[PDB]
Structure 1
Amino acid sequence: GLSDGEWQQVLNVWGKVEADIAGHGQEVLIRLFTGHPETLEKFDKFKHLKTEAEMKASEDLKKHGTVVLTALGGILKKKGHHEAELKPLAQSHATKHKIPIKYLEFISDAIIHVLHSKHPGDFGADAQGAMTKALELFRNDIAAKYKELGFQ
């Protein structure tokens, strides 16, 4: 649950992402894959990537980064009223991709890391607080659907 002022911070930060969605999406996935190499094994189309240089050179990884952040941005713009947008993603990630909630924690922290890396000194403590709360809400509502499905 976020206040109006917190949502305003989230959507202000998101403007930074929308200026370069592919570059942000690429770096988020690279941070996930290099920090948590077990996550790469869930992607049949990226498991061939052995080095970060190959990851950086992969145009399909940048494409998928655009898909991921476009979906997340659509959810964030609903300011919590995201049941219709979130349900299909919860279902596909639990039942088809088999993504444990832990990996959603990993990618949430990766987003925070990338924002500081690309905007050092321009991602203030209030903005980090609000973005963190928004990603916690996203993860918590996914977790509720995971529990319904019995997925661990």
Structure 2
Amino acid sequence: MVLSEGEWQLVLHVWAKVEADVAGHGQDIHIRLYKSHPETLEKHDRFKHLKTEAEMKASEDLKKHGVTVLTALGAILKKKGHHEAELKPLAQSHATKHKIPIKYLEFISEAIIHVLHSRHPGDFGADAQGAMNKALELFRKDIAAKYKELGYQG
């Protein structure tokens, strides 16, 4: 699949707003991920004891991890689909070490969309939401292909 230049412009314009508060976006995204899909929290041995939204917001390690995640994703989105070298290490770790099924990447994709609409309801209208849906779908499709290249169905 492919995004137009104009869809990429909407993706990166919204990403600038994420970059104005990376840590806060990361926390909101992970809290939604873990509350709606508790099975995902189980993958994070160091976080899996956190239960309430207050406890997750108080974890300095979870806050740091949200920055790590969104920094890697931002680098990928800024490549506008030419992200092979960025995606390679991410698939390697998530498929062979952490064993994150592709389904969990759909869960976190939903959470990103929800948080972007919650924080930026004006700038994240239908056009902008459609573009970022497409960018995250391309990301999942390409990392699923790398999973299979490594021998993992995901």
Q: TM-score, normalised by structure 2?
A: 0.96
Instruction: Answer whether contact 2:27 2:62 (CA < 8 A) is retained.
Output: yes
Corresponding residue for 2:38?
37
Indicate yes or no: 2:117 matched with 1:125.
Answer: no
Q: Any idea what SS the aligned residue of 1:44 has?
A: coil
Q: Which runs of 4+ in 1 moved over 2 A?
A: none
1:61 corresponds to? 62
- 1:71 corresponds to: 72
Map residues 77-96 of structure 1 onto 2, 5 A cutoff: 77-96=78-97
Count of residue pairs brought into register by the alignment: 152
Q: Deviations over 1:119-151 (max 9, x none)?
A: 123311110010000000000000001112232
Letter in 1 for 2:136: L
Percent of matched pairs sharing the same residue: 85
CA contact (8 A) 2:14 2:123 kept: no
Q: Which runs of 5+ in 2 are unaligned?
A: none
3-state SS in 2 of match to 1:42: coil
Normalised TM-score (structure 1): 0.97
Deviations 1:92-144 (A, max 9, x none): 00000000000000000100000111112331111001000000000000000
* Structure 1 counterpart of 2:104: 103
List gaps (5 residues or longer) in structure 1. none
- Counterpart-to-counterpart distance in 1, 2:129 and 2:48: 31
